[PDB]
């Protein structure tokens, strides 16, 4: 499938709990925490960089935020979360900018899905796109999609018909409409909920 939107305004649910990195996306789904892949969040420790709050075309920002430490998930999957010093150089608060996604019991093959991030961000200026799609195949921590994605979209939320979080992209087939998530199974629900800061 190759349905591609630009998200012009991101100041609304769910598209304000989308982040941008530099090298790609991530999801906030409590209080100064995100979720992203796990060299999305290696490379901007060593470059040290700042996080943007659902950065749209149009939209007003939601603020540019320092990270305060980083959290790998021990596993084989791509999954890091990470959190943020929840105050920015502007005054912005983080928590007063951004909404916490839900989780989302959990999903099934033949479901219609929405994967929201930057594909080729530094080329656009960083619009927000919304991708649509479907999951063709759902095994235990691995998922397959056939939303259209580039790259741009390591760590984009895929979500369903109910704006819920079922898990994030990590990889693509080779352009691509084929692409591979880390589905969330109840067990990296728990290890998610267990770093979210409070």
């Keep these: 499938e190759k349905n591609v939107k630009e998200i012009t305004d991101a100041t609304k649910e769910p598209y304000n709990s989308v982040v941008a990195f530099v090298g790609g ?4 789904v409590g209080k100064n925490t995100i979720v992203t892949n796990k060299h999305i969040a290696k490379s901007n420790d060593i470059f040290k960089n ?5 950065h749209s075309s149009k939209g007003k920002g939601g603020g540019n935020y320092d990270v305060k430490d980083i959290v790998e998930y021990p596993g084989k999957e791509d999954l890091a979360i990470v959190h943020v010093h929840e105050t920015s150089t502007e005054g912005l608060n983080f928590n007063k900018n951004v909404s916490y996604t839900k ?12 994967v929201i991030g930057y594909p080729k961000g530094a080329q656009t200026k960083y619009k927000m796109f919304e991708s649509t799609g479907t999951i063709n195949h759902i095994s235990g921590t691995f998922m397959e999609f056939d939303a259209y994605a580039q790259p741009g979209n390591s760590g984009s939320p ?20 084929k692409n591979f998530g880390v589905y969330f199974t109840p067990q990296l629900k728990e290890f998610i909920q267990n770093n979210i800061e409070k």
């Design 103 to 114: 989780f989302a019991d959990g999903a099934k093959v033949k479901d219609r899905i929405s």
């Design 25 to 28: 996306t991530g999801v906030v």
């Design 50 to 54: 700042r996080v943007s709050a659902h």
């Design 158 to 177: 895929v979500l369903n018909s109910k704006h819920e979080l079922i898990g994030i992209l990590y990889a693509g087939s080779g352009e691509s409409e």
